[PDB]
Design a protein around this ligand. Structure first.
Ligand SMILES: [Zn+2]
Ligand SMILES: [Zn+2]
Ligand SMILES: [Zn+2]
Length: 572
């Protein structure tokens, strides 16, 4: 009940009651909040409510101090002072953007813009508020009960009447009932249990609505620039393999934190693992939001770093399968690879946070609270995909608003930029270079002459809202018969339901653009499926076409993106 003001830090007994996160607001700030918002409940040791029996006056503007107690205009004694006067709310120890964060529903992009352009304490207030809103919205959905079990990989579900049905995709990870987390993909649906259990009729599934903890640490610590490398001890026998990053690894030791923008295949994990070879005695904690991102850092470390000094931290609630070669849960090993939510409370010489476009400010703050490091390195690319914002339905979230790190990379530029793409045929590198990298990304590979584009709108059908284009898949089938080398291609599309249809018709492994991020394949077959803002998103398009090492086939719906593709056009 006695704390610090979330806007000006002045100590106060006042907490805003109408705020879902109940922030401490000082006398000047509590007033400016209650007089310009629907928020009128003020909390202290005792709430600011009328003390007269059976009275329901809770608005702080309609209340007064009757000596030591509180009363409305109808119950106050003659010697009563209003709680709201001269720009203050009465309390102990006697903002436009705070109001908007406190009262928004988080469905508009302008809400997220504000949550990243505001002061540092308001970024934390915005991040807990948003995460709390996102969790309380999980309750709004209806329960799914197993009505019948067809086989080991297929079932038929029964939904709650009156409550909406959450969108069916691998993004929504449910909690079965405690029979394990379960995921669903499309009247016969496919059931995916993270824990092997013989599907029971009658058992139900409910969302993993986890409690939102308060944020204490900033999203970014205050920046420190040094005259020499601090607390880190460099090598001189630094492997030629990593010689290109020597000036960048020194930049890492002469700053508290540093940002690395690495377009696809420019050497991000090679840079991250190479930083351990450059500072060979340094204890490095490698973190990222996803298990796949942490596993990709584990794979690179398995090749360059000693396996006995490595440890893959796995949370006791082992959700899905991850890296199995390091000693598990040995928190004290020199190299610790761990997802953000599983991080222990520890210190490090360097903390490497990879896939930074996928971090929220909540993730940025959590990392600063569990890890106290001499140096922090944020690696990623604001031209790649951000973390999905389940509440956001109106407006588009631009890269400078993904998180604090992305905001910096897009405004003042990144500290370091990996300028040479070594993965993709030059047709792809030149296309994304002009599209999202202002012509600063260079191709190492030659043009493969295996990058094709076809302008074919097809027919758009829908599985609730996830889209399907059977004619675009038919064009891919006609292409495969004529180009059998493409039999080893990964089918990619912006929609789960397009992927499910293509898996049955084509037999190729499938992946959504969002799940393909960080992965690479020799051949990629992309079908745009629709002309929505989702399928036309330049960051999603960039990720989609930069998955290919050798060739790509793009069946496009949008004239704009089709025209921007520096690929050989196919006919029919
Ligand atoms: Zn204040
Ligand atoms: Zn409030
Ligand atoms: Zn009253």
């Amino acid at each position: 009940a006695v704390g610090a003001c979330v806007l000006c830090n002045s100590q106060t007994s006042l907490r805003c009651g109408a705020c879902i996160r109940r922030p401490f607001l000082c006398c000047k700030c509590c007033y400016d909040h209650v007089i310009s918002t629907s928020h009128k409940l003020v909390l202290s040791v005792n709430p600011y409510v009328c003390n007269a029996p059976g009275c329901d006056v809770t608005d702080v503007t309609q209340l007064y101090l009757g000596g030591m107690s509180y009363y409305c205009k109808s119950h106050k004694p003659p010697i009563s002072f209003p709680l709201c006067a001269n720009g203050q709310v009465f309390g102990l120890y006697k903002v436009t953007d705070f109001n908007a964060i406190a009262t928004c529903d988080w469905t508009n992009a302008g809400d997220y813009i504000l949550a990243n352009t505001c002061t540092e304490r308001l970024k934390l207030f915005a991040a807990e508020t948003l995460k709390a809103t996102e969790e309380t919205f999980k309750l709004s959905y209806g329960i799914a009960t197993v009505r019948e079990v067809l086989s080991d990989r297929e079932l038929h579900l029964s939904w709650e009447v009156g409550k909406p049905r959450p969108p069916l995709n691998r993004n929504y990870v449910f909690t079965g009932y405690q029979i394990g987390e379960y995921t669903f993909e499309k009247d016969a649906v496919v059931y995916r249990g993270t824990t092997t259990y013989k599907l029971n009729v009658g058992d139900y599934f409910v969302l993993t609505s986890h409690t939102v903890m308060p944020l204490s640490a900033p999203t970014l610590v205050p920046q420190e620039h040094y005259v020499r490398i601090t607390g880190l001890y460099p090598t001189l026998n630094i492997s030629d393999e990593f010689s290109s990053n020597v000036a960048n690894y020194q930049k890492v030791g002469m700053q508290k934190y540093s940002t690395l923008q690495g377009p696809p295949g420019t050497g991000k994990s090679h840079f991250a693992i190479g930083l351990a070879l450059y500072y060979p005695s340094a204890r490095i904690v490698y973190t990222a939001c996803s298990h796949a991102a942490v596993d990709a850092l584990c794979e690179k470390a398995l090749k360059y770093l000693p396996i006995d000094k490595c440890s893959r931290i796995i949370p006791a609630r082992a959700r899905v399968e991850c890296f199995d070669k390091f000693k598990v849960n040995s928190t004290l090993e020199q190299y610790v690879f761990c997802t953000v939510n599983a991080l222990p409370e520890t210190t490090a010489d360097i903390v490497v946070f990879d896939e930074i476009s996928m971090a929220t400010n909540y993730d940025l703050s959590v990392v600063n609270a569990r890890l106290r490091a001499k140096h922090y390195v944020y690696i990623g690319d604001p031209a790649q995909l951000p973390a999905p914002r389940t509440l956001l339905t109106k407006g588009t979230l631009e890269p400078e608003y993904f998180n604090s790190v992305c905001r910096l990379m897009k405004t003042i530029g990144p500290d370091m930029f990996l300028g040479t793409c070594r993965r993709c045929p030059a047709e792809i590198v030149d296309t994304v270079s002009a599209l999202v990298y202002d012509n600063k990304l260079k191709a190492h590979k030659d043009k493969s002459a295996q990058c094709f584009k076809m302008f074919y709108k097809g027919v758009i059908t829908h599985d609730v809202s996830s889209a399907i284009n059977r004619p675009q898949i038919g064009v891919v089938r006609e292409f495969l018969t004529r180009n059998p080398a493409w039999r080893k291609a990964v089918f990619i599309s912006p929609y789960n339901s397009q992927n499910a249809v293509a898996s049955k018709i084509l037999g190729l492994p499938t992946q959504t653009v969002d799940s393909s991020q960080g992965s690479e394949y020799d051949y990629v077959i992309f079908t745009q499926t629709t002309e929505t803002a989702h399928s036309c998103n330049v960051n999603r398009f960039n990720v989609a076409i930069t998955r290919a090492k050798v060739g790509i086939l793009c069946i496009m719906s949008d004239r704009d993106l089709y025209d921007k593709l520096q690929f050989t056009s196919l006919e029919i």
